[PDB]
Amino acid sequence: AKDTAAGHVTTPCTEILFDLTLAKHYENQIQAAESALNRNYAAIRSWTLLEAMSSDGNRQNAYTGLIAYGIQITVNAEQELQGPKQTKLRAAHALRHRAANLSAALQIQAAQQATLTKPTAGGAQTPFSGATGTCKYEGITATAGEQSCKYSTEDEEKINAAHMNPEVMTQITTIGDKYLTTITLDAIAGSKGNPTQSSATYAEQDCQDGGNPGPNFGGANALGLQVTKLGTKATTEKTNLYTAGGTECEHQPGNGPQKTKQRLAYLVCEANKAAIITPTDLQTLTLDALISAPEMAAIGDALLIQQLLKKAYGQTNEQFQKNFIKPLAAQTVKFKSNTVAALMSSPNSGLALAYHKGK
Amino acid sequence: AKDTAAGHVTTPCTEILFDLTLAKHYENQIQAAESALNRNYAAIRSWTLLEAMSSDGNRQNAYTGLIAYGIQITVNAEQELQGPKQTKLRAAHALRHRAANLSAALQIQAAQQATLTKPTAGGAQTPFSGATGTCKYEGITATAGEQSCKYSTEDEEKINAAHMNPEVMTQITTIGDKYLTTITLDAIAGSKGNPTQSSATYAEQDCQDGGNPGPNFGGANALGLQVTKLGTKATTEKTNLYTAGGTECEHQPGNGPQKTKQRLAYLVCEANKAAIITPTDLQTLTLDALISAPEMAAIGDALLIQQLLKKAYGQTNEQFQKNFIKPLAAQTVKFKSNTVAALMSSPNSGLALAYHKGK
Ligand SMILES: *[C@@H]1O[C@H](CO)[C@@H](O[C@@H]2O[C@H](CO)[C@@H](O[C@@H]3O[C@H](CO[C@H]4O[C@H](CO)[C@@H](O)[C@H](O)[C@@H]4O)[C@@H](O)[C@H](O[C@H]4O[C@H](CO)[C@@H](O)[C@H](O)[C@@H]4O[C@H]4O[C@H](CO)[C@@H](O)[C@H](O)[C@@H]4O)[C@@H]3O)[C@H](O)[C@H]2NC(C)=O)[C@H](O)[C@H]1NC(C)=O
Ligand SMILES: *[C@@H]1O[C@H](CO)[C@@H](O[C@@H]2O[C@H](CO)[C@@H](O[C@@H]3O[C@H](CO[C@H]4O[C@H](CO)[C@@H](O)[C@H](O)[C@@H]4O)[C@@H](O)[C@H](O[C@H]4O[C@H](CO)[C@@H](O)[C@H](O)[C@@H]4O[C@H]4O[C@H](CO)[C@@H](O)[C@H](O)[C@@H]4O)[C@@H]3O)[C@H](O)[C@H]2NC(C)=O)[C@H](O)[C@H]1NC(C)=O
Predict the structure, then answer these.
(1) Has the keyword Cell membrane been applied to this entry (chains A, B) (predicted)?
(2) What helix, strand, coil percent values describe chain B, rounded to 5?
């Protein structure tokens, strides 16, 4: 189904959640690819130690073949990751920036009740040069308590990385810009009698004199105003990621001024298109994956073709695991103690290699 | 001198610049350390190829010693980087979040001129149950054009990574929270005559009747209000990074509610304390740096002590550079073509190794 996550964005808080969840999805895709590279480099260090520890030329050549394979695919994958990584990080950064902006706006747009100050009475004065009474208030303020976004179980289910694979995303939903830019308020003035500069009894936060000044314009003459509410209403808007044909990103930059929603849509589209390719996980390699790997044809030809690969690595995956995979975790190495893979990722890694290459 | 950069923060825009400049400084420290690691791993791949290409056992052992050294120091440095990296990224993320917040607030606090709507006249009505005239305005708004921060040459000189080494930073300066939270406005009411529900001539964005209604309360009876300005004034505040003794971070979390400035100060202090250690640059290694390296004592003992190291690597740095450093950039490798270091960081890296290990 398309757009489950964006179609649940109906409020400032749900846009925030979408933006941060999608940013974290892109960041997690990069972290997962880098973790995979680091696992592969760890495997290569482990096989380098095992090569140094074997005395059989054919077993040594087999380890060399796994080192060579590993270096080739992992160096390549690390190079190929960089473009998608930068694309995805540009979008993650922008999404986090937007979510920050919107959260800050939310706090201000929650300031919906005003505190009046004590006014000063006058007669005619700017901007009412024709008035006989004025009541002037300076520094009326509105502030809210600390706001927070509260999410339901379903909000977190629907606005979730599980719904943010590229094949399902066609649009983003954003709050209209006026929520970010505009202060909105209602206000009312009230008059009784003949208010003038002498209406200087201010106990009710208005200007009164005559009679018995008091609550609800008790006095003979009164003038006042109240700001009865503030706050701009949020609206939502939809922006397509792709052009009509569905391939190309809409909202490419450089074609004229753009709105926030259009810049975000472009970045999201490009980050969705920039798919990451992860290489094989060397630490869990199977025999069939090794001998079917395209890079192993030339590597095998150089060191030893699929017939030759089985002779070196095993006729069964059981044999392959036994000889080339299980030793990473289970084989202890002691000299003057740790298992192969942990040792070759530890502070003694290089020394372990020097020691066994020397012995 | 202390606090050149924070002492130039006097405005919202200069706080933004400080926050983003310091975030980028931390991000650049991490990028520089990772670049250094990647250069070292590239050198290790290069020496692995040269080991495979030599036929002299003693030259082979020498390359093995550089591989072992490189692995040890680079794996260690990569492990040791992770804690400081995470600390520095927590601060960079928070600084960028703050700068976003403040930029969003700046846009709203620039909305300083109101647009009045056409009012509706009444008599007594809430919140003026004692009035004889009211003039009620709904949806008064204030919006600014797109704001931007403009920096002088000196702003960029003083609020600069060159002034953000830890030894010079004792405090941060931040805008007061009210700029982020509070709407401020001035407003004035004006009255003439006996305004009532019949004061329903609205051409001047006030309530008039009687006589000849017009500009400046031309009519006999008038009531109106104007919002004459909006905007909350920025203030600045200083927060110390360290406790009085100067070692420990002030504002540790977990001791009670904190303000934004205190959370930021804590994160900045921890990111400043979490110094990164970069290992030696293997691609520009000198002979004296190699034989003075502590790790080379055991590695040399294992493969070959400083006397033995000079026998393997050269009695002069000229000889060392000739035999072990210059070949990385200058030695061409061809088989069925590239220089050593570029080849071992290219898509043919592993195959180049397999080819020469087989030949
Ligand atoms: C989070 O919220 C913040 C706060 O509101 C918001 O920040 C604002 O971002 C906008 C968009 O980036 C910033 O506006 C940019 O401002 C610069 C600088 O303008 C000043 O300085 C230049 C001199 O360098 C003067 O020319 C100018 O008069 C100002 O004094 C502009 O250079 C940017 O221009 C481009 O975009 C404009 C529309 O936004 C166009 O009108 C303009 O022509 C430019 O577009 C063209 O060039 C683009 C680049 O080549 C191109 O891609 C376009 O297609 C087109 O060809 C722009 O005006 C604004 O200053 C920020 N405000 C503050 C207070 O920081 C964040 O955007 C928001 N973030 C998210 C992700 O939601
Ligand atoms: C950019 O601008 C944004 C927008 O203003 C701003 O976001 C706001 O950040 C604050 C600070 O993080 C957020 O406040 C936090 O809100 C949570 C959630 O509160 C709700 O939900 C909980 C249930 O989980 C309810 O209990 C609660 O009643 C609310 O309904 C709170 O859990 C956080 O509490 C800690 O900090 C408070 C003070 O801020 C304390 O009063 C509270 O006791 C907690 O502190 C204690 O626990 C801490 C953690 O263990 C500990 O370190 C302390 O020392 C202490 O022991 C907090 O209230 C707020 O919701 C965000 N607003 C929105 C709209 O997103 C960003 O902070 C700002 N960023 C930057 C970097 O400038």
Answers:
(1) yes
(2) 50, 15, 35
Q: How many CB atoms lie within 10 A of CB B83?
A: 11
Backbone phi, psi, residue A205, to 5°: 60, 35
Compute the residue count for chain A: 359
Pairwise CA distance, residues B4 & B155, whole Å: 11
Alpha-carbon distance B9 to A353, whole Å? 53
Tokens read off for A58: 């054919």
A308 and chain B in contact, CB less than 8 A: no
Q: Do A192 and B348 touch (CB under 8 A)?
A: no
Q: What angle do CA A193, A195, A201 make, to 5 degrees?
A: 110
CB A108 within 8 A of CB A146: no
Residues A71, B353: C-beta atoms closer than 8 Å: yes
Q: What length is written for chain B?
A: 359
Cβ B350–A71 below 8 Å, yes or no?
Answer: yes
Method used experimentally = X-ray
CA distance A160 to A14: 11
Q: Does B45 touch chain A (CB under 8 A)?
A: yes
| B358 CA from centroid of ligand 1 (Å) | 59
Report whether the peptide linkage leading into residue A127 is cis, meaning its omega lies within 30 degrees of zero: yes
| Cβ neighbour number for residue B78 with a 10 Å cutoff | 21
Residues with CB under 6 Å of ligand 2 are A 100, 103-104, 106-107, 146-149; B 94, 97-98, 101, 253-258, 260
Write out the H or E segment, with its range, that includes residue A47.
Answer: helix A12-53
Ligand sitting nearest the alpha carbon of B12: 1
B101 lines ligand 1 (CB under 6 A): no
What Å resolution does this PDB entry report?
1.2
Both tokens of residue A106? Answer: 């939310």
Distance (Å) from CA B242 to ligand 2 centroid:
23
Supply B13's token pair: 């825009």
User: DSSP label at B161?
Assistant: G
Q: Would strands A120-122 and A207-209 be described as parallel, antiparallel, or unpaired?
A: unpaired
Q: What are phi and psi of B235, to 5 degrees?
A: -120, 160
Residue partners of A245: CB distance under 8 A and separation at least 6: none
Q: How far apart are the first and last CA of chain A?
A: 62
Query: Rounded to an integer, what distance in angstroms lies between the CA atom of residue B301 and that of residue A177?
Result: 69
Is A179 within 8 Å of chain B by CB? no
3-class secondary structure, A313: helix
Phi/psi for A110 (5° steps) reads -80, -10
Residue A246 DSSP SS3: coil
Q: Which stretches of chain B are assigned E, i.e. beta strand?
A: 114-115, 120-122, 133-143, 171-175, 182-192, 207-209, 221-230, 236-240, 332-333, 338-339
- Cα separation, A62 vs A47, in Å, equals 10
Q: Where do the structural domains in chain B lie, given as residue ranges?
A: 6-104+275-358, 111-152+162-249
